[PDB]
Amino acid sequence: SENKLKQLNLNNEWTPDKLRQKLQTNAHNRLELPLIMLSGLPDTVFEITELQSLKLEIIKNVMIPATIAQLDNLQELCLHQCSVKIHSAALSFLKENLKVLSVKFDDMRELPPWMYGLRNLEELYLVGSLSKNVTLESLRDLKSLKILSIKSNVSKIPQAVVDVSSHLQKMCVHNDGTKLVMLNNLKKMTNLTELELVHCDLERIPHAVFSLLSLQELDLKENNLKSIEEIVSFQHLRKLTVLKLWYNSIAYIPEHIKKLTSLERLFFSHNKVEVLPSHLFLCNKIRYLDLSYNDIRFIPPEIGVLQSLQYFSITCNKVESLPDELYFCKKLKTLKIGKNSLSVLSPKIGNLLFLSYLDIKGNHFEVLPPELGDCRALKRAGLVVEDALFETLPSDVREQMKA
Template structure:
């Protein structure tokens, strides 16, 4: 039996080449694999099983017929009675098995139609030709080097974190300066930048809207090292473009192989349709061997005729689908202008007017990448969906040049997490994500379409923002009227704190949870503005001393409070006014004494107290007055139990266990 793995090399391609394989090429590859399996299966049957089985056919002579009539009249038999056939005898040699094996072989060669004999081999050969033809332009000496070079640069462009504007600065094309030029000035003839392959793939991403609410500053100039790398990539693409645009060899090779597949499809359909009925079970055969066996005529059975007939019809159907796909490819090739590629949309939306259009093979490869983009991005994004800690279906995107259009087609999406993605725009199509409730922005600068702002104001319930620069804080977050949870992480200077006071949170009427991981020195007034409905407040201060905590007294609805790493030396007295407080976490502070813990007895609802990672030296006896306390944490503290309060200390240890 022929192992299928022997043919695997014909169907496999280098993974990098797949970026230039449109959906119809991928589909025909699958069809070729199925046809290859039919051919291999048929060839295996030809080798493993008997091909044909023959039996002798008896005949009667004229003299015999007259004798039979006389006998019938004498015996008063009916004329239509069955005749008695004369048995023939040949040379007796005890070689019956060898004789009929010889007859089977002779009849297989002489009487069986050639299509019934060679059908599996025809399928195998045709399929291998289809496979070679479909990938010939990847391996042709005049085109393979160009394709490999293009794919390597394309990978570097997509892996780079640089924006188109930053690359234009490095290459000496400052778009802001060009905007001040007169419209009559001639357009520069500079070559395409590395952003061009990216731009076209992001052209389908549609990340720039018609109307923008928030304007963010442009990308900063790259540092020296990154600038050198970007310029090297720019020069590499420049030289490649000058070389590739000289001819259209890739386009011609692809057109020729497509035309060849169409012609081959028509030939296969034509002759297979006319010959498929030649595959029959019963075959009559005449072999001049009567001197040996006594018989000349034989009746044979083609043992695989029924199976081969079914396989041939199945093969014809597959070839028909393959041919229709090739016809569609031909239509796409000749209907569209694939030797020109325009960046008009990108020029309009980015303001970079010096991006020239490309032609010939460079344009053709960009068109092929477009077809790859439209093939399976939806499925790839769906594979990245996973449940987050809040039991929401989340999609995480990291270091992309833009937001894919297909993100907004995932209607089941509930949480969107964007990391290190700059100068992007959330378009109006975000309104298609009716289940979107959570948005995370980690070191991102973005803009919002007007429709997107309206949609987020009504739907968003959780917002997480991690920023390095204060300007990355989105101003539109203060208008999210249905926002329930807000998490801000980043360094806030004193000036930024004043800005937070000015940018009041009082419009967030549904806000219940607020988390600040920063370096504040006091609780901003903006937090007090939402104190009437705020239930959870988390302040992680990264070691900066937090003073002036009197504002806490106004937050009477708090049920959960965390003051972590705030350099507190004593428990703030303002906490004792929070009568609805249920959980209090004072982790990683500098608490040495907790004598005032007795005041917690007024907090009737307090069930959890966390004093871990502190410098507490002594556990007072009056801690036993906290009757409502259920959980007490002293882990990683320096608490010492006095001789008089040993029993109490053991009690607290049991609580924290």
């Protein structure tokens, strides 16, 4: 008797107007309705047929009724610290329709056991503790799973993921620093194209990565990497274009990196690099190069050979001079000089006709070159500088950049 009146007072309060007031567009380009502290699920929720995602936060003892079948445009479900039970027809609807799922559990209490039966699920995001052996059930009935992201404290890639190896394409594990010591199952992730082993305390590039011949992107963030001479084995991965070694302790970029033929995006920010060698710029197909938060002092002239370079960042280094050959990278779209030790800015920056973002705040400039007006895509909103330095620009250069 009390439960009926409870839901009556939830449905009375949450009318479709006040519910649609909370409608927004989420990070996955979907129309989402966020519920944050309710006593349950209002039945009126199933009248908002236009919503594409349903986000539940801190709602304990939730039951999804069969009226969930009314949400004809339902592709995503989000659970933050929620204990959710489903109806039979509700689970059938979610099995045939739910495509993206994101669950955050403080305890195993909030990880729904029905999630393992959603075959039409394409993306799965878990943020919670799953550990010896992972307490993840076999992803056996996720027949269409493509992206898996596990945020945990896990020491081994669970065998549960080996049951999705035939069609899984992107796997992300961002552990809390717990060392991933058993990497054997990663060898069975054949059809993987993007891999993220972040903050796993690996300490060396793992051998298993060299088994993913179809791998294109790689993220090894926050793993205390000091020696990366295993880059040699990456020439066995002939389709690798994105290689992220950022947030490590690397001080020496070996010559073997020049043999990474298909390299285009190189993430080397937040390392211990003091000298960037000549051969680093023999990877002529590089578009993205972030070397920020290092001890770089000189930029080599050979960077001029990177004719396809569009993104370059050396913020928070010890750079004292920039080579003029840098302004041969005529496709430069973003230049982040940032907090260095530059005394003068070359007029040849006018050659970068595509430059749209420049950050030179925190340097040793005395006057800015007028040829900054030749960068037709660069605006003051996209130009980071000391306002006193921006005053050194010619008057109409100033106005043309502001309007």
